[PDB]
Design a protein around this ligand. Structure first.
Ligand SMILES: [Zn+2]
Ligand SMILES: [Zn+2]
Ligand SMILES: [Zn+2]
Lengths: 341, 147, 341, 341
């Protein structure tokens, strides 16, 4: 009958033996090129036009649209648990606010500058990062200023973004993160910071490799950011575009970026690996996007995977791919889990 | 008896299974056991059976432990008894081990490599792309990434 | 007597065994770094001065000189079979047309702009590429504007080519491909596109490494391009010039090329390999030249090789050497063969 | 009306100027990484079973099937013009000669050993290379010894080839060139040479990267080599297989090859480039195959290109891709042309 066959074997070659290095829990930690800490997390905030808001973003699980009068109460516990940095997103809901040139982007009375001022006052230890773009302030919803045909107007756009970025810094933001993907904007923003004598104190965190895609769905709802006048495929990198992303990282670093962001994250981990060699001397940051975030929550509610587990796996994945920073909506969770782990 | 894996007896067995499949008509063999040195034994076994010139050896060179194999366990009634599989499956943060496992497997005879999981390990595919630049790389879109 | 001798042998080393990887038809496909698809093909068109033309180019097998009124009928079936792009070559036969400065190069009523306009109208999905050069429009037949001695005048030439290129784009061409080989023309053309606000929508496909040679014979007949006033060895790269070709690829990429062309192709496959590392982040295109093309047809008619076979071998050769695009006169053939293969 | 437009231009950047390096005939020679000399040529000889033969190989232009009594007359003028080396191919036509094990491969009375002996005697300065394979001596026509299923039997094949190779060397051949493509044969042949105390005086020239293809047509006629029992795609490299060819060059060098051959040549120039880096320390040789050779003759007779011209272009192409040796049927021609050039 059928019996278990066992082939004759030669002695074990030492080169085949990797096992001695990961047979214990501690060894699996010794094995990571980088360990996850609380200071590597950056939590995004969607600041509202209505100071009393604390609105539910149905498509973005456990994330709200917070007004300034509701900020101290929200941030107090996070900061008490170790939060070190936040990234501001403005959501001006007052009518009449939006226009073709994103005028309200740097409005001193707008949510962003208002949130910056509030934070520097009630939380002077928090590191403030401000996303820099016009999508949330333009009536057309696109990332920059358009020509009449509907296409983006590079020089006028970068000219505008540069101003917004300097204005945020002038207001007190420690860092500026342009996520517009428009050619040459980093150079203009850096030059603008230098002319304002703010470049020696403003970190420029560029979204150097930001891809077009099906993963920004819930963020559009939270920032009321959806475009009008098509897709964003002309400035956002195509998903298969690895050469463009590689040339965009070299460009941005050359133009002054002090750090880079890869976005999305899980779906673009190989891109983080590339940036790790090209921008080896700068901090790399992974952005765990709204759609990657809600995809983890759905699969988890479906029983497919376990939230905490897959969150740790995915997040250590960023650090493995080369990132040392992470912008993620799971920050409140991690600020808790890291106490234990 | 302790519950740990027995390398030599395991690779000895896997080598036999692999040759037997090939003997039956399979064009390719893909070992997904993650046990040290199995590729060499399987390649040697194929050579001794005069089947190495016609059998592609597709190794799961970089196969990580994780929370993404849930549905596959149900489909193959594969769930272990006697703990986790973390001693042979690569830890998720283990990029050096995965890099040394790709070099090992290629050196031991792999004609192609598999990275598994896939989406959650795309940077690993990038590494394999340079280390195993001359062989076909395959991504495995796992049951849990799929569901 | 003489008997078959067989030397004593040691067991087989695993490192000697490559065979397990290509013993089946599918495996031979798994083995290619890149597979050939219909969208990688670019078909050249020689547009005539006479809208009713459909003239036979005796030295270029199965290729004609087509006028605008004969274009819809020619292109309809190709496009129905998958054609995605074309490269336009103008052949103005009206007398008086040619002059020392290639004036008619950008003539709005000339074949090129007329063909561009017709195509954008009857075939809005087709990607239009226009070769950019003065050889087909100069009375002397050379690639640029000459000094009195007969040598090329760099600044005046690049100055002219830049204008032609922007004019084509202004007319609707999506891409410009300069094949003049004159020092610094890419920079001038890119700057010209930027000044015209067309650089964000115009792909610049440079013939970065274009060699002098015995393989352009049939193309001279099809475009009535033969020079007057010697050889083209001063701007075309010498065949043995690998360092120059390597420095020309770095130059062109630095000056703005979005993609590069290697030309010729089969006879310069090692050059495609070099470009693959130097211009690793940009699309590389092989140009299967008129003479390589008719050489395959002759050898085939001689029984030396089989057309379809050698065409597949040669074309996958480009993809092996690193190209991801191919400009070739066998496009109609391949658009058929790829259905099967 | 339409006037020649000339765009405004900025001063010339020195980095755009390559022209100063190739504006004179001599400079085009200074530009080659390697110049072509008579000692780089290797001329193939098809030795016949009939010592009085001087037979015309209809598919291979100007190449014959020469018997030993017709050798001194053929080789005298070539050698007087500079020929330094030849590669022997045996074509035993006597019936009964062929068998399943290629027994006659090393027959002391066969054409090869007979030609080796004749050459070492009447031409002691000539360098003798002998192709090593069983295709021309097996009744099935394949490159090695088969199992019953029709597939190749690696160990028995390499075992046989090793013997043939040592036997040729024992007879006086200075070099052995295995073109069988069977896994691990180089190691067995090198070991066999070492055991015979002939490794310190026998150059092992391996056909390390030999591709399957549509270019060996005329050679099959000249060596009466066509297989029986299908294609040779299991051991010959697939055309798209660049990784396999790269691993085959590393293997062969590791197993003892003193030099490598790339075959075919023009159609595989990128492969020569790869070998140039991998086998940077060994002589690389290009084999201008029978089909590439007759393709040049047909295109030339068709007026497509000029023989002499395209021959120089193609041959300097090998040297550009990295080769320093060339096996070619145009050797008689080049031995003449090089006097002038
Ligand atoms: Zn935006
Ligand atoms: Zn021209
Ligand atoms: Zn053979």
């Amino acid at each position: 009958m059928h019996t278990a066959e066992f082939l004759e074997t030669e002695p074990t070659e030492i080169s085949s033996v990797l096992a001695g290095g990961y047979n214990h829990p501690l060894l699996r930690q010794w094995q990571s090129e980088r360990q996850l800490t609380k200071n590597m997390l950056i939590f995004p905030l969607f600041i509202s036009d209505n100071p009393d808001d604390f609105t539910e973003i149905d498509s973005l699980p456990n994330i709200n649209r917070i007004g300034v009068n509701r900020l101290k109460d929200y941030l107090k516990p996070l900061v008490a648990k170790g939060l070190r940095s936040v990234i501001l997103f403005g959501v001006p809901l007052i009518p009449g606010t939006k226009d073709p040139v994103g005028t309200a982007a740097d409005d001193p009375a707008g949510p962003v500058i208002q949130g910056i001022k509030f934070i520097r006052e009630k939380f002077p230890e928090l590191y403030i990062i401000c996303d820099v773009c016009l999508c949330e302030y333009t009536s057309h919803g696109h990332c920059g200023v358009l020509y009449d045909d509907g296409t983006i107007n590079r020089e006028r756009s970068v000219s505008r973004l540069a101003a917004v970025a300097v204005n945020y810094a002038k207001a007190g933001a420690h860092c500026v993160a342009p996520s517009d993907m428009i050619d040459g904007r980093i150079r203009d923003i850096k030059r603008g910071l230098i002319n304002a004598n703010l470049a020696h104190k403003t970190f420029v965190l560029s979204y150097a490799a930001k891809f077009s895609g099906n993963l920004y769905g819930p963020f559009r709802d939270a920032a009321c950011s959806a475009p009008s006048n098509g897709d964003r495929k002309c400035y956002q990198l195509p998903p298969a575009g690895r050469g463009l992303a590689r040339r965009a990282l070299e460009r941005d670093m050359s133009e002054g970026a002090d750090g880079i962001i890869v976005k999305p994250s899980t779906f673009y981990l190989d891109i983080m690996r590339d940036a790790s060699e090209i921008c080896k001397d700068l901090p790399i940051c992974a952005y765990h996007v709204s759609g990657e975030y809600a995809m983890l929550h759905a699969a988890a509610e479906k029983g497919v995977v376990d939230l905490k587990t897959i969150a740790f796996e995915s997040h250590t994945g960023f650090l493995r791919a080369g990132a040392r920073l992470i912008i993620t909506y799971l920050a409140p969770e991690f600020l808790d889990w890291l106490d234990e782990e």
